[PDB]
Amino acid sequence: DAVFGDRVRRFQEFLDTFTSYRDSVRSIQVYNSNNAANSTSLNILPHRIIISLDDLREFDRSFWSGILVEPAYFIPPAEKALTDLADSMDDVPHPNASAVSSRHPWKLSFKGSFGAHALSPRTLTAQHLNKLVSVEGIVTKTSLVRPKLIRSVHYAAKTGRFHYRDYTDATTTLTTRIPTPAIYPTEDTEGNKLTTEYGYSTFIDHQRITVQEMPEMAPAGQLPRSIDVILDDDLVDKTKPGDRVNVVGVFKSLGAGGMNQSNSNTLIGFKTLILGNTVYPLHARSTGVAARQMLTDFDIRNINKLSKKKDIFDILSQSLAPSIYGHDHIKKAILLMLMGGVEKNLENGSHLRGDINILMVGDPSTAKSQLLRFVLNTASLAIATTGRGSSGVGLTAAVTTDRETGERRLEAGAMVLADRGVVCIDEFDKMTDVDRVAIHEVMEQQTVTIAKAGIHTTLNARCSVIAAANPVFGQYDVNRDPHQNIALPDSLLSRFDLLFVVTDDINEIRDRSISEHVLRTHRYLPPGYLEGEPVRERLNLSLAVGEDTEIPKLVTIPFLRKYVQYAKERVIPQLTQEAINVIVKNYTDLRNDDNTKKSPITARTLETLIRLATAHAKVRLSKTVNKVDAKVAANLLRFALLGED
Amino acid sequence: EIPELVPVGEMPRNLTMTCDRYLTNKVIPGTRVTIVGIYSIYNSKNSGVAIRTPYIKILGIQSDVETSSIWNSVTMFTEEEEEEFLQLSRNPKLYEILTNSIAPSIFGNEDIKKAIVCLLMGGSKKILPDGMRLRGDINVLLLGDPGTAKSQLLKFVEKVSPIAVYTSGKGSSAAGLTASVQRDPMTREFYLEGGAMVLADGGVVCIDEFDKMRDEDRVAIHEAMEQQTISIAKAGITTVLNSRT
Amino acid sequence: ALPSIQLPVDYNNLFNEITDFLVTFKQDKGPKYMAMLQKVANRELNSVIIDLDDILQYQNEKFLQGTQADDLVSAIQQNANHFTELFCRAIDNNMPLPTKEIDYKDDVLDVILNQRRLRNERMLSDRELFPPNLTRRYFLYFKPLSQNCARRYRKKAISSKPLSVRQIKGDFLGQLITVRGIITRVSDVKPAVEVIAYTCDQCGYEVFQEVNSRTFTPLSECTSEECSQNQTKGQLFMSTRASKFSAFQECKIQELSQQVPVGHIPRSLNIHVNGTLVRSLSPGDIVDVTGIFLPAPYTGFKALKAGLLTETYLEAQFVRQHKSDVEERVMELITSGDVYNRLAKSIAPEIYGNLDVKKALLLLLVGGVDKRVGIRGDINVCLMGDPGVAKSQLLKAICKISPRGVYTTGKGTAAVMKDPVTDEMILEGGALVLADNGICCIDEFDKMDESDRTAIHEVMEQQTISISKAGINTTLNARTSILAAANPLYGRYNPRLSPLDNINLPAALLSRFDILFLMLDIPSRDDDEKLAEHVTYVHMHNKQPDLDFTPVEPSKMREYIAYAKTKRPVMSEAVNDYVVQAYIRLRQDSKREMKFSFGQATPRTLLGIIRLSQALAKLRLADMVDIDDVEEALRLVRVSKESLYQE
DNA sequence: GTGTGTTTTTTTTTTTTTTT
DNA sequence: CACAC
Numbered sequence A: 001d002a003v004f005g006d007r008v009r010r011f012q013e014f015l016d017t018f019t020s021y022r023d024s025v026r027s028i029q030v031y032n033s034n035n036a037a038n039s040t041s042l043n044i045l046p047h048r049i050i051i052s053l054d055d056l057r058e059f060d061r062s063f064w065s066g067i068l069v070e071p072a073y074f075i076p077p078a079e080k081a082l083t084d085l086a087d088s089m090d091d092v093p094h095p096n097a098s099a100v101s102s103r104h105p106w107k108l109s110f111k112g113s114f115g116a117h118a119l120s121p122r123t124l125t126a127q128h129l130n131k132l133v134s135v136e137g138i139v140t141k142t143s144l145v146r147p148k149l150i151r152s153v154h155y156a157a158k159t160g161r162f163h164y165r166d167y168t169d170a171t172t173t174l175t176t177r178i179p180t181p182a183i184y185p186t187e188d189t190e191g192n193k194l195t196t197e198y199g200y201s202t203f204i205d206h207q208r209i210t211v212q213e214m215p216e217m218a219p220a221g222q223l224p225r226s227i228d229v230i231l232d233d234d235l236v237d238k239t240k241p242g243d244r245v246n247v248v249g250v251f252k253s254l255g256a257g258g259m260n261q262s263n264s265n266t267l268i269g270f271k272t273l274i275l276g277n278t279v280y281p282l283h284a285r286s287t288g289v290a291a292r293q294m295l296t297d298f299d300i301r302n303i304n305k306l307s308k309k310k311d312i313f314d315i316l317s318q319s320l321a322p323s324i325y326g327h328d329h330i331k332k333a334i335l336l337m338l339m340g341g342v343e344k345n346l347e348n349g350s351h352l353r354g355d356i357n358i359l360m361v362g363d364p365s366t367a368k369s370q371l372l373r374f375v376l377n378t379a380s381l382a383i384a385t386t387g388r389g390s391s392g393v394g395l396t397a398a399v400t401t402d403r404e405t406g407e408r409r410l411e412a413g414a415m416v417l418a419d420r421g422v423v424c425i426d427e428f429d430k431m432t433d434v435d436r437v438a439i440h441e442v443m444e445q446q447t448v449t450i451a452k453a454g455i456h457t458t459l460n461a462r463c464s465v466i467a468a469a470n471p472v473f474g475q476y477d478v479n480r481d482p483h484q485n486i487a488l489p490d491s492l493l494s495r496f497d498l499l500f501v502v503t504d505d506i507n508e509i510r511d512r513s514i515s516e517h518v519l520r521t522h523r524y525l526p527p528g529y530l531e532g533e534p535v536r537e538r539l540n541l542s543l544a545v546g547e548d549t550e551i552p553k554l555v556t557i558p559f560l561r562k563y564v565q566y567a568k569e570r571v572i573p574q575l576t577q578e579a580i581n582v583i584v585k586n587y588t589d590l591r592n593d594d595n596t597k598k599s600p601i602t603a604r605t606l607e608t609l610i611r612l613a614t615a616h617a618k619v620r621l622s623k624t625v626n627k628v629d630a631k632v633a634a635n636l637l638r639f640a641l642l643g644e645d
Numbered sequence B: 001e002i003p004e005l006v007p008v009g010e011m012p013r014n015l016t017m018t019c020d021r022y023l024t025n026k027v028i029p030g031t032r033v034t035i036v037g038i039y040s041i042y043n044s045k046n047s048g049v050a051i052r053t054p055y056i057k058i059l060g061i062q063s064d065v066e067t068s069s070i071w072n073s074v075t076m077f078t079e080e081e082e083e084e085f086l087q088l089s090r091n092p093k094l095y096e097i098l099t100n101s102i103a104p105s106i107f108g109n110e111d112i113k114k115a116i117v118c119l120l121m122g123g124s125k126k127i128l129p130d131g132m133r134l135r136g137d138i139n140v141l142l143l144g145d146p147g148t149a150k151s152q153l154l155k156f157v158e159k160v161s162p163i164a165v166y167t168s169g170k171g172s173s174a175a176g177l178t179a180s181v182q183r184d185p186m187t188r189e190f191y192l193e194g195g196a197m198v199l200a201d202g203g204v205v206c207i208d209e210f211d212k213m214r215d216e217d218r219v220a221i222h223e224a225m226e227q228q229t230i231s232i233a234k235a236g237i238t239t240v241l242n243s244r245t
Numbered sequence C: 001a002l003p004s005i006q007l008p009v010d011y012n013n014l015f016n017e018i019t020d021f022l023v024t025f026k027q028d029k030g031p032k033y034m035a036m037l038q039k040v041a042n043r044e045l046n047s048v049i050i051d052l053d054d055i056l057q058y059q060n061e062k063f064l065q066g067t068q069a070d071d072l073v074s075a076i077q078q079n080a081n082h083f084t085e086l087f088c089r090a091i092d093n094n095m096p097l098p099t100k101e102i103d104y105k106d107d108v109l110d111v112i113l114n115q116r117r118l119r120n121e122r123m124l125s126d127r128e129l130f131p132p133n134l135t136r137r138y139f140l141y142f143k144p145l146s147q148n149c150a151r152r153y154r155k156k157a158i159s160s161k162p163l164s165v166r167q168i169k170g171d172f173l174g175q176l177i178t179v180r181g182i183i184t185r186v187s188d189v190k191p192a193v194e195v196i197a198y199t200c201d202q203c204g205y206e207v208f209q210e211v212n213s214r215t216f217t218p219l220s221e222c223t224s225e226e227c228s229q230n231q232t233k234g235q236l237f238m239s240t241r242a243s244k245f246s247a248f249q250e251c252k253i254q255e256l257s258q259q260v261p262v263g264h265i266p267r268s269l270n271i272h273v274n275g276t277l278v279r280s281l282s283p284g285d286i287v288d289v290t291g292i293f294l295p296a297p298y299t300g301f302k303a304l305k306a307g308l309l310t311e312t313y314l315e316a317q318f319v320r321q322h323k324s325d326v327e328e329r330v331m332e333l334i335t336s337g338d339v340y341n342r343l344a345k346s347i348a349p350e351i352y353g354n355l356d357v358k359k360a361l362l363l364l365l366v367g368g369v370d371k372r373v374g375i376r377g378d379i380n381v382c383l384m385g386d387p388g389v390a391k392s393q394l395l396k397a398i399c400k401i402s403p404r405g406v407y408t409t410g411k412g413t414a415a416v417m418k419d420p421v422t423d424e425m426i427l428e429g430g431a432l433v434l435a436d437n438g439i440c441c442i443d444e445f446d447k448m449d450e451s452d453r454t455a456i457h458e459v460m461e462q463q464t465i466s467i468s469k470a471g472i473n474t475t476l477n478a479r480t481s482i483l484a485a486a487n488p489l490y491g492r493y494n495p496r497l498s499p500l501d502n503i504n505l506p507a508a509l510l511s512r513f514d515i516l517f518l519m520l521d522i523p524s525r526d527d528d529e530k531l532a533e534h535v536t537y538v539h540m541h542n543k544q545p546d547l548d549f550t551p552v553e554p555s556k557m558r559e560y561i562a563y564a565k566t567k568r569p570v571m572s573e574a575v576n577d578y579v580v581q582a583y584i585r586l587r588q589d590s591k592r593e594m595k596f597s598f599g600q601a602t603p604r605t606l607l608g609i610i611r612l613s614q615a616l617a618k619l620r621l622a623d624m625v626d627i628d629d630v631e632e633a634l635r636l637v638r639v640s641k642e643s644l645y646q647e
Numbered sequence D: 001g002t003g004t005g006t007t008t009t010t011t012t013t014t015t016t017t018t019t020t
Numbered sequence E: 001c002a003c004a005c
Ligand SMILES: Nc1ncnc2c1ncn2[C@@H]1O[C@H](COP(=O)(O)OP(=O)(O)OP(O)(O)=S)[C@@H](O)[C@H]1O
Pocket: B105, B106, B107, B108, B109, B144, B145, B146, B147, B148, B149, B150, B151, B152, B153
């Protein structure tokens, strides 16, 4: 075990070389000590340290190569060295009589460049076993959090002595050791009865998730492939199904593969999985950034400056989908949806939803699906759905069975996963009626209920619904009222804040402008691409893993996403009496209007007006709603209903 | 087994085999290959007495549609055949040669043959920075009187196209065209199995008897023939795969 | 080998200080816990609730005068299981003698004690025998710490902070924690064996075997000294009379909707309650349960299959629910506030207009009483209304204010059988039976299938639903007041179209309802304006625009119904005469109207009028059914009938 | 002392198919 | 795997 000590001491020398890790350890220890000294508080920092592989390579290339080649013999010594360093500089406070027994090993985390070890579940060949690799994918299945024993403490009530027995498993420790029968020793060696001392025994949270590659880099004619990852201790519950992620960990192998006289000729392989060491939640489909995008002070200052622009609303609306010609009011409604109004959690169980749900029905090839595709590519949490390609069980909740434990469980559907997000439903008229009541309940009360298979639960899906629909006929018939032109119940239409009618009327000047714009779009050439060259995709932009006035016509899409996130987080507008007068006046005028006879205008339209005013106040970043918000909301609603302007 | 080699009134016989190392991921389902291997035996414990499961251990593959993907989405083209392709591209009458090379047994139908050539070539896929994409496939429908070799044209297209799936109008279900949610018999878990049109990813699907589409089955292709994507939300599975067919 | 570790807990000093605490604690009669132990000796109590506040106060007292404590409050939150046995042994050591003439007619354990003592003593002179748990007729539980509001709560006292299921990390195993959550499934009471009391066929010996493993093996081998020395090899016979059993219940508590992060699924936790805490929980309970968090093992062969991955449960110790003085108060409200008008607005303060529908809701909440048969005291109304009218909000408010009130949509009741394969339970409930002595708020009554149609029918003329799974024909009582919130088909209601043609419900079922109202919205200049003002004010202040008396508590209706149920306002002979001529003239005007045929007067309308008058007098003292009562009931009925003929 | 035996599952959810 | 047959 001399090599183990040599690796330990070289790692400690490396740690002393870069004191930033020492400062991070000190900060974590003092934060935990202060929280312990300070009440309804439960936020405790973990015993994990994130290092950069580049610094290790610069200091000792041999150690870095051993880490990236055979981590099973290099990371345990590093963990021991980190634990020794932490204890040495530990504030040595009064022991809790538990931390002495309850071990707290200091986990290791990694970031930086990985090279050929940045892989995908499809490309994870068997040659990478026992080698540390980084794999990107989507979380699809998550087993229930299940603690497991690693160390049992027992008290002998005949000698007054505490005996500990450490338990090891192939899924717990990297180095292979004899599995322990997981039996508590009830008797001492000297015939003394031992009582199992819970609380002083040590258990760790364990989880088993499934990570599969991107559907979009999945090769033609092949379905995405998946691997199993074992998150442990801190990493449990840090991810949920439907999350894009990049995990860094050891590609380990388990099982007997037959080879036990049970299967001598049978050709079954071995169990392969990943013991996750680091999780980095890349999201927003940008391939390298998280959903909660970091906001620099310069970006916040620029956002504040642009908030003083008079027509910033119009600029952002037009900057949404530049490649989509026209449809300006639709873009305004989309921008309002992406960053909507406030949700009122009233008393006595009353609940007023703040999400905006818009149904837009129109003629074929009117960019109805492309608008939803753009919203999917832009929104922080957007889930795609097809009316034909969807089942209510697969839309809300599915009663499956667990495999790690072997018993019943619920799995989230398409809208539950989109909680606090947006659901883009194409071919809305094509949805099955039996499962259409479920989405109706969703958009009605933002909650689903399950009362089957001995499971009586109520899940929350506070999503914003955008739907694209086609007329009953091949095209819309303006000679008919907008009830028979739609094959959906008017009760289903009522819960939508806005219903947008798209007509593909054949103009000449407008058609010429559309054709010119579409041709300008189609003649675009990517910067790093030549003419007559196929647009190949690799997306291996993860060169490093982890964190490693003004009047512009159109802003960049990531900047717009940052602005939307900052607005949703920061400003909580308050409705104002000046907006109240305008809202009530417009609601009264629209309600008792002759042209509004065909309209379904009811009290829900007042809720739509309030939500639109709140969203428009969010657009201005004003912490209170104002008259201009009410005027713009009334104009947009009047456009949605009548379409005159 | 090859459909042309099945016995009369007999369903095709399946047979399991195993690749190894460099032979792994050499082909994809739907491809016609030839295998030289060892006819081996293993005893599965899953209903007679002293029965033994037969299989093949592979020692060679001879395909004609290249490796996984379309030659792994890159050129496996040797210099001689590439130079021959360049020489063919410089033929001024190449358009006429290709038109005459489409369904030679089918008389006339020159415009249809030229449209088939255009479809087999297809446009260039465009991916804008803003996020939405522009497809590069061509969708062609052939209406007309029966007995005009339209089915023969579809069969020839399926024969000549590197990736092609030929389907019948009546024998077609929406869950069988794009994706089927099936429960795993052993693990009791649901999973997706690619449909007919998915197997034709990057190629072409020749749907005969298009008038015999079930109205609930015909609509299921509206998204995928335009967006080139298939959205599935079933049995706790929510995915959006690509089908550029 | 078994390695050893050193831990500063000092179980011996802790036990001695525990004895000192029990003996020498006098809360601000003698010591409280010595009084409780004496009462236990009097067989007047078998539930020792160890309050953490008492231990904390004892530590506070002795800290000022010697610091003779080791922070036991923090010391037992680390491993409460051992301290439970420590407290049990302390109670047994300081167990007082009985100070009451308790009858010992059923003293089987005492009989066994004295018999075995005499049997041992007759050879002891040569001319522990009993388990410590067996002698105990009591059970000990822990009461969690209250709020501190002091520096002692320096993130400590984990039992004082209500956790959620997701907050229960594996490190908390062995701690005494607490959770806040809603039950979903409670098991039945079952006898779990504590110690078996085998008796040998020969050698006359009885051997005890304590078991805490959820599964054990019989002895059936006379290892007793006499049997062993004689080599008789007698088999042991299990004896329920001398064996010790404990009532047990296994609940399955889920986490509240607020404790679930976005895009996640609520979890569950199994709770093992035993002793006198059994039967203290129901599925419809939202509670703060404090107990010991323990890793229930896969003892047997499944442990080998699974490994170190164990399962967890909570050994609950304390439960706190969340959910004629009031009688004098409701007379005060009656004299001050006009219930007919004030409580009408109180039902739907946030809903503007439709005050008569609110009064009908009050009458339905009160309900008639004609239990004598020869009928029914349930008032039923259907709110067909019009899409866009706040019928759903009215039903939600009724559900939140009516005791045993449940709300559901037409499309989701009914019943199910043997939902879990493992336990194979019997006769699961539904939604209609949930509001047995309550009201069911049926939204989407139109979008409701023939099966539930016949179910709610059988309920409404039977006050009971029935199922026939396998010819069992078992039935579940549901005397539920029916509150329907259907809406006219094809969206908006058509006044020109007949009301029964506007809704896809059978006319027979509709006529059997006691009363029905058309409340459809019509675009006006002022009513919409005032409603918009109301909604805007609610948005401003998160509260109603209080312009009148707005009582909140619904227990006033509870007092009214409980008071006047026994009273049973007797109909007067003049009442019967006036209602009989009322029926005569109502049928006459129904014929002379024959414009919609639904306006025909029926004896069912007479039953509805009788029960409405009964409810009216039920709210107003007793025997108020007179000319005024029947006039009010007939006015309401005629208003409802004209509502169908509105415009 | 050599060699066993469990724990161990068919629900709910899709997809098809014939009637209705 | 390991305790019970
Ligand atoms: N122009 C043509 N040249 C050669 N053969 C032809 C031509 N038109 C028709 N045929 C023959 O006519 C037959 C047509 O059969 P199919 O192709 O199966 O039917 P179809 O023409 O597609 O029309 P359907 O399927 O009945 S609507 C084949 O035997 C063809 O060879």
